[PDB]
Amino acid sequence: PAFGMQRMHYRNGDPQTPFQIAEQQIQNFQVANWLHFVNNNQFRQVVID
């Protein structure tokens, strides 16, 4: 609604979580970079001590 985009047509078993398919539909640097961080966030597995 902040960009007049179509609401969504979301399958249940879609492998892409909606922030993945949102990253590649809307066109704004800030929101898209935010979603990029969210999607590609993960723990860093590392052996310490």
Place this chain on the structure above:
Amino acid sequence: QFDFRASMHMLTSNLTFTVYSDLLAFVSADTVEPINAVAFDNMRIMNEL
């Protein structure tokens, strides 16, 4: 006049059949789980979630 020999006949028939009126009684049916129920296009119905 009653001619006995000429009035005599042999009657053909089957031997020991059996008749069934209802027919869908021997069937035992069940649906798949309705959430994974699919239309003609092999694409699920009521999947928007």
